[PDB]
Write an enzyme that holds these catalytic residues in place. Structure first.
Site, PDB file in Angstrom:
ATOM      1  N   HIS A  44       0.941  56.077   4.876  1.00 28.00           N
ATOM      2  CA  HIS A  44       0.094  57.191   5.284  1.00 28.00           C
ATOM      3  C   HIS A  44       0.827  58.231   6.128  1.00 28.00           C
ATOM      4  O   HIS A  44       0.194  58.928   6.929  1.00 28.00           O
ATOM      5  CB  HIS A  44      -1.134  56.669   6.028  1.00 28.00           C
ATOM      6  N   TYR A  97       0.364  55.161  11.098  1.00 29.49           N
ATOM      7  CA  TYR A  97       1.126  56.388  11.289  1.00 29.49           C
ATOM      8  C   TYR A  97       1.741  56.415  12.681  1.00 29.49           C
ATOM      9  O   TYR A  97       1.799  57.454  13.341  1.00 29.49           O
ATOM     10  CB  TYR A  97       0.252  57.618  11.054  1.00 29.49           C
ATOM     11  N   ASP A  98       2.209  55.259  13.139  1.00 31.25           N
ATOM     12  CA  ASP A  98       2.776  55.088  14.466  1.00 31.25           C
ATOM     13  C   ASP A  98       4.278  54.845  14.362  1.00 31.25           C
ATOM     14  O   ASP A  98       4.866  54.869  13.278  1.00 31.25           O
ATOM     15  CB  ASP A  98       2.087  53.935  15.197  1.00 31.25           C
TER      16      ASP A  98
END
Lengths: 647, 645, 111
Positions: free
Chosen positions: A148, A113-114
């Site tokens: 995600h 989730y970066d």
């Protein structure tokens, strides 16, 4: 290295070159850039909840349970507050990101989730999907699937999948993303990276895979980067589960706490291996050459000038029959092949199938006229011949042939070409349409492509002729009778109203696009571009030598032109292509023959070779054989021959 | 494919089966009452469409043709070579993305390839959003082309040998280098278009050809229509096609204009056009009449043709075109703009030489254009100040490593064919000769390629003005002493330009003392007179040669006597040694059976004119007629052509 | 090695990559050198001039002045491509032509 590792690398390289490679990026890669990990977050949550931490009570389920308890007790504001506190910072990109992007992946699937992978694309356009509405509104056909839910829309906890509640209802909340990931895994070739073997996502993927059939899917590749080399039992168990493991600590020795070196070594090996061809023995070289050449066996004759396109500019194939190394950085397979050719004893070093493949390659290369390298070249002499009755103009023979009964698809193709040369264009189009319809059962498709090209050319010729006849029908004909029916023309117009010749090659299967690369040049004027330019240059030389009164006593520079001329004719008359009925080809043949005749006449008379240089320089001579007369008669006009006779 | 746009500016309907929308649009354009029939915004749309169509030179249909101007204008500073203007424009801070694009193209043109690559990287970083992906695509293509050009220039230029400098002046350091390879490890240009958004692929389809290796095969193939020998045409449409391609490639700031394929295409098209025009002219004069058409070819050439010829042609190609397609019988067009171009390029080369800022990447490209332009300027007439400026630039500040003294002399002689020599450029040549004389003061010797040296200049000066005496060289040689030997040889090579006192100063050093010394003196023509002492020396030389009974020496004295330089009948008694001696001593009694016309190939214009006017005429005309009837050689044909008939 | 040579009929000589070890009379030894010919039919000077072409001899790449050019004693001709003795070719091709310089390395046309 190990044989299985070599095979895996070869398969990965082939998949990447074909454009069917996808990468499953794990969380270790993001950690390599010092991104905060999840255990730090769970430690902070545990400290905030109770007051003191404890190392002993930390299992796989605790990492998913403690944040859930924090959300249930403290609420929602605190969760996103902690997330923002620990996730607001920005970190630089990693060399592993650039290395993995340089491998040219079709899609990229990541469970992070970066934004580190996002900001790594260097100048590449990728469509980002992290929510459910974004799947339908994709702008391109290349997918960066963040499973995600990255933090693009904000730092709230509802956009991510962290707690146990989100993990349990993941399938219910995210159907489209899961389906897209599953089908992407099903179609492309997938390589995992930065994942532990005991990770939850890998186990879920294996559980889903176990539901499929035994041979209905390809085994995904995995890369393991741990200090401890993998045990035999674990490797066997995971291989039996349908996942092919490549170890990193086994290949390269390093200490326990170093992580970048294993990733870099594996990725460097992957990047270097693509341009390298793993050929060491005669069997491998022969098999590689056969794999490259065998698709060309369908066509009767191939010209030597475009053969360099098959080998990707690795060898300049000279027109006279010699080859020269141009960009072959790796092993000199041509050198080994010619060494095998020159020595009969080494032919026993191959198996029976390889020996017969070598015999077939010898037959093909001797038919095409390739002899040997430039260094080995001596005084080789090459004659020319054509094996088509259409070229020789034996009209009664082809009429008798067209009276015969068809026996095969290739025989029908020959009949269609011969009938088209006979002027009965309506029956030619009908036969070509029948061939296209009946050629559904095929293994190569080259006949289908050639027949479609011929059909389009015949349609264009018919339209041009029916348009042009009315212009000259008033005076040179007088009768003004169009030899066609309006029903036929209407059906022709309806059938060919949407056939686009530009993208016909692009619509062909990938196998055809990979093997028959040269045939694309047949779809336009490109196949005449590589010759014409050369001719022009040679003209600018020959006339320059003619006005200065120079008599070269060596090889005549016109020979190249002559060879190229004949070469083109053969390739256009033995494969039965209608392009021989065009105007540009006629002009090119006329120009080549005119230049040849002018040079021959200029060199016919000499001053010092008769009296001063009579002891050598005798090789000057220009025979005029049957082929030259046929070429002049076919592709010349009265005024051109008048100009030749004048000059 | 609904309509075909004929390059004259017309549209024709070929493959449209629906409503004739283009006809309706042009009908709306024609009439004026049809306005106010649209709901405001459509009026603005029509105005914008009309502006775009008017800019691109589309006017009417084929049936509504009202004659075509077909005026071609290119408004790109890079095409006209306004180097100072673009250099100034680069400095100013940018405003929009397209401004950075133009700045990057200008930087790439000027040779600062590292800065161009950095600017392209910045542009591709910034312009990834929005619906203007055209700039992103063009920047990607230009960056790839720049990388390819950098690698090719490094491979061919860096290493592989170079005599101009010992080291290459570091063509991009190893920090800038070896980094592009990391960034382009496996870059593929074939899939760049397919990865674009579907709206980009729907809209900008026409740009796909920019991603291919070869994109000019159609025009090269269609060039074959210019070599037909059968009696708008093809030359006109070919010329507008070339102009359209050039304008499209230059106005959009595309780097692909600096590759080999484009230059080859331009060269082929121009050469074929000129050849076809010459053939048509010669057939017209052959079949109808000599001077009925005004002895002027129909290929009127203007600014842009000269620019293309200068930029895209090598010296050898121009030489071949001149030899086979003589241009002196077809006139030039605009002259003021051509003179402006020449003075601008002369100023550019003088600035490059003076400021020592020689960008090797830019210098290699620029020097070929400079050489071609200065060679081709022979057919143009220039003003006094422009001629002086270009002559000063060529003689003074032109790099020595490319043009030697002989090549510079050839260029200068070609320059003054139709302009003659006024006082100004003569003074400039004097400043060169004195300057050369100084550089002479030492172990220094001039090096030439064609075997021509500074003395030729003086000869040309003495040919164009016979009453000139240089005070500076006279003063230089007045103080000259006998310690030096090479410089004094240079002054003897430039004898006739010195004053009477300087003439005496040098003439004292002249000392005939031996027959070989006389030979040495007459090679440079120091002894223009023939004193009886020199005649007696020749007498004793011939007597020694005769009593003695390799190389050939008697030929010079034979020519001299046949040229009436020796006014004494003394050598007639020396016969029986060699043929030509008796030929040029006793023309009546010479045996013509031993004659060989090969000597006629080594006779200059003056000797050929002298022998042509002497009666000897019919014997040589007969033997050369036999030679030409046996072998068709051009030299004997020309000798009969201009002199003996 | 005979494929490189070319016969020029404008000035009636030969051009061929070759190097001359000529010997000058009076026991004067000259090392390897080659000939250069230039064809200039449009000359400016007059009276004393008697030829149309200019012939120079270059030694090791530097010019040499001519004092007594009578070295008609052949030369140790070598084809510098692979160092082949082609002296025989030059010696028995010289007398067959009337040109004083049958072999010239490169020629230059200034027409």
């Amino acid at each position: 290295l190990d044989n299985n590792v070599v095979e895996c690398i070869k398969e990965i390289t082939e998949s990447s070159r074909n454009g069917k490679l996808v990468f499953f990026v794990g969380a270790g890669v993001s950690t390599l850039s010092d991104y905060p990990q999840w255990w730090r977050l769970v430690d902070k949550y545990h400290e905030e909840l109770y007051g003191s931490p404890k190392k002993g009570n930390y299992s796989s389920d605790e990492y998913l349970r403690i944040p859930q308890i924090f959300y249930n007790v403290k609420g929602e504001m605190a969760f996103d507050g902690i997330l923002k506190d620990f996730f607001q910072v920005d970190k630089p990109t990693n060399p592993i990101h650039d290395k993995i992007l340089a491998m040219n992946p079709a899609h990229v699937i990541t469970t992070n989730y970066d934004n580190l992978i996002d900001t790594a694309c260097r100048g590449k356009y990728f469509s980002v999907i992290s929510a459910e509405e974004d799947v339908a509104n994709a702008t391109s056909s290349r997918y960066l699937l963040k499973v995600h839910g990255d933090f693009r829309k904000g730092f709230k906890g509802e956009n991510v999948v962290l707690k146990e509640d989100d993990y349990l209802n993941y399938d219910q909340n995210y159907p489209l993303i899961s389906n897209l990931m599953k089908t992407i895994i099903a179609t492309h070739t997938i390589v995992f990276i930065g994942y532990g073997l005991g990770d939850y996502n890998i186990n879920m993927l294996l559980n889903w895979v176990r539901k499929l059939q035994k041979d209905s899917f390809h085994k995904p590749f995995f890369i393991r980067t741990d200090p401890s080399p993998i045990e035999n039992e674990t490797l066997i168990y995971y291989e039996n589960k349908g996942l092919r493991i490549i170890d990193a600590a086994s290949l390269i020795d390093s200490n326990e706490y170093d992580y970048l070196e294993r990733y870099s070594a594996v990725m460097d090996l992957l990047i270097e291996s693509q341009e390298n061809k793993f050929i060491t023995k005669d069997d491998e070289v022969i098999d590689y050459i056969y794999g490259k050449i065998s698709p060309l066996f369908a066509l009767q004759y191939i010209r030597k000038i475009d053969l360099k396109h098959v080998f990707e500019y690795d060898y300049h194939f000279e027109v006279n029959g010699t080859v020269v190394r141009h960009k072959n950085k790796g092993f000199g397979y041509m050198e080994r092949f010619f060494e095998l050719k020159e020595s009969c004893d080494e032919r026993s070093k191959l198996s029976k199938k390889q020996y017969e493949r070598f015999n077939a390659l010898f037959n093909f290369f001797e038919k095409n006229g390739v002899i040997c390298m430039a260094k080995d070249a001596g005084t080789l002499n090459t004659s020319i011949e054509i094996n088509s009755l259409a070229y020789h103009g034996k009209y009664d023979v082809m009429k008798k042939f067209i009276e015969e009964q068809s026996v095969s698809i290739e025989d029908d193709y020959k009949k269609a070409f011969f009938l088209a040369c006979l002027g009965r264009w309506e029956e030619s189009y009908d036969l070509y349409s029948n061939i296209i319809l009946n050629s559904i059962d095929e293994s190569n498709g080259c006949v289908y492509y050639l027949s479609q090209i011929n059909r389009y050319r015949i349609y264009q010729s018919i339209t041009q002729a029916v348009t042009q006849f009315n212009g000259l029908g008033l005076l040179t004909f007088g009768r003004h009778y169009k030899p066609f029916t309006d029903e036929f023309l209407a059906r022709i117009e309806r059938e060919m109203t949407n056939f686009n010749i530009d993208d016909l090659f692009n619509g062909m299967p990938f196998e055809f696009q990979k093997k028959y690369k040269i045939l694309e040049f047949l779809s336009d004027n490109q196949f005449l571009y590589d010759d014409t330019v050369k001719l022009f240059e040679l003209t600018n030389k020959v006339r320059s030598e003619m006005s200065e009164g120079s008599y070269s006593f060596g090889m005549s520079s016109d020979i190249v032109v002559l060879l190229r001329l004949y070469d083109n004719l053969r390739f256009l008359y033995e494969n039965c292509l209608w392009s021989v009925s065009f105007h540009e080809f006629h002009q090119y043949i006329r120009n080549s023959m005119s230049l040849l005749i002018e040079k021959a006449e200029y060199e016919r008379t000499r001053d010092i070779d008769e009296l001063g240089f009579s002891f050598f320089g005798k090789k000057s001579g220009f025979f005029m054989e049957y082929y030259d007369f046929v070429n002049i008669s076919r592709h010349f006009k009265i005024d051109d021959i008048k100009n030749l006779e004048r000059s | 494919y609904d309509y075909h746009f004929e390059v004259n500016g017309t549209v024709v309907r070929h493959k449209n089966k629906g409503f004739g929308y283009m006809e309706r649009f042009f009908e709306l354009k024609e009439s004026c009452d049809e306005r106010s029939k649209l709901s405001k915004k459509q009026y603005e749309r029509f105005n914008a469409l009309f502006n775009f169509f008017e800019k691109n030179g589309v006017i009417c249909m084929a049936k509504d043709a009202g004659t075509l101007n077909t005026s071609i204008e290119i408004n790109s500073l890079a095409y006209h070579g306004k180097y100072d203007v673009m250099k100034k424009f680069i400095e100013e801070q940018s405003v929009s993305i397209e401004d950075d694009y133009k700045k990057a193209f200008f930087l790439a043109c000027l040779g600062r390839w590292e800065e161009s690559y950095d600017l392209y990287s910045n542009i591709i970083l910034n312009s990834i959003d929005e619906s203007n992906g055209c700039v992103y695509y063009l920047s990607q293509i230009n960056r790839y082309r720049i990388y390819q050009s950098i690698t090719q220039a490094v491979t061919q230029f860096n290493g592989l040998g170079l005599l101009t400098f010992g080291r290459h002046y570091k063509p991009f350091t190893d920090e800038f280098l070896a980094r592009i390879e990391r960034e382009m490890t496996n870059f593929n240009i074939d899939d760049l278009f397919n990865g674009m958004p579907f709206e980009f692929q729907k809209k900008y389809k026409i740009l796909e050809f920019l991603s291919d290796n070869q994109f000019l095969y159609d025009d090269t193939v269609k060039l074959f229509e210019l070599t037909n020998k059968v009696r708008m045409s093809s030359d006109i449409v070919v010329l507008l096609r070339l102009y359209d391609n050039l304008r499209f490639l230059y106005e959009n700031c595309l780097w692909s204009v600096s590759f080999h394929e484009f230059h080859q295409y331009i060269r082929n098209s121009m050469s074929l056009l000129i050849e076809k025009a010459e053939y048509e002219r010669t057939r017209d004069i052959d079949e109808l009449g000599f001077s009925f058409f005004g002895k002027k070819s129909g290929f009127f050439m203007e600014y842009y043709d000269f620019v293309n010829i200068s930029r895209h042609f090598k010296i050898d190609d121009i030489k071949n075109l001149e030899r086979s397609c003589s241009i002196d019988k077809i006139r030039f067009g605009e002259q003021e703009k051509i003179e402006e171009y020449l003075v601008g390029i002369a100023e550019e080369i003088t600035k490059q030489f003076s400021a020592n800022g020689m960008n090797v990447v830019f210098y290699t490209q620029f020097i070929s254009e400079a050489k071609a332009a200065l060679y081709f300027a022979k057919y143009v007439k220039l003003s006094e100040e422009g001629l002086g400026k270009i002559v000063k630039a060529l003689l003074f500040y032109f790099p020595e490593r490319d043009l030697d003294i002989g090549k510079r002399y050839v260029w200068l002689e070609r320059l003054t064919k139709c302009n003659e020599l006024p006082k100004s450029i003569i003074s400039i040549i004097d400043d060169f000769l004195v300057l050369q004389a100084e550089k002479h003061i030492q172990n220094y010797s001039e090096v030439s390629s064609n075997g021509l040296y500074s003395r030729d200049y003086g000869a040309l000066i003495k040919h164009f003005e016979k009453n000139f005496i240089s005070k500076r060289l006279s003063e230089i040689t007045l103080c000259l002493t006998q310690d030096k030997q090479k410089q004094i040889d240079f002054l003897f090579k430039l004898l006739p330009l010195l004053s009477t006192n300087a003439k005496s100063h040098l003439l004292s050093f002249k000392s005939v003392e031996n027959i070989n010394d006389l030979m040495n003196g007459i090679r440079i023509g120091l002894i223009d007179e023939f004193t009886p002492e020199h005649e007696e020396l020749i007498i004793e030389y011939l007597e020694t040669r005769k009593v003695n009974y390799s190389n050939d020496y008697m030929s010079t004295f034979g020519i001299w006597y046949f040229l009436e330089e020796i006014n004494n009948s003394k050598m007639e008694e020396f016969i029986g040694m060699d043929d030509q001696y008796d030929f040029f001593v006793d023309p009546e009694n010479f045996d013509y059976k031993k004659f060989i016309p090969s000597w006629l190939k080594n006779y200059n214009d003056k000797l050929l004119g002298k022998i042509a006017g002497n009666k000897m005429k019919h014997h040589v005309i007969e033997v050369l007629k036999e030679r030409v009837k046996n072998s068709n050689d051009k030299r004997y044909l020309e000798i009969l052509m201009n002199y003996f008939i | 090695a005979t494929h490189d040579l070319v016969y020029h009929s404008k000035i009636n000589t030969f051009v061929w990559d070759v190097e001359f070890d000529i010997v000058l009379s009076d026991s004067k030894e000259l090392n390897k050198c080659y000939f250069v010919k230039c064809f200039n039919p449009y000359r400016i000077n007059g009276k004393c001039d008697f030829a149309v072409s200019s012939i120079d001899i270059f030694s090791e790449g530097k010019r040499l002045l001519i004092e007594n050019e009578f070295n008609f004693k052949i030369t140790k001709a070598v084809h510098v491509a692979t160092s082949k003795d082609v002296t025989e070719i030059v010696l028995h091709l010289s007398e067959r032509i009337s040109s004083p310089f049958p072999i010239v390395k490169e020629v230059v046309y200034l027409d």
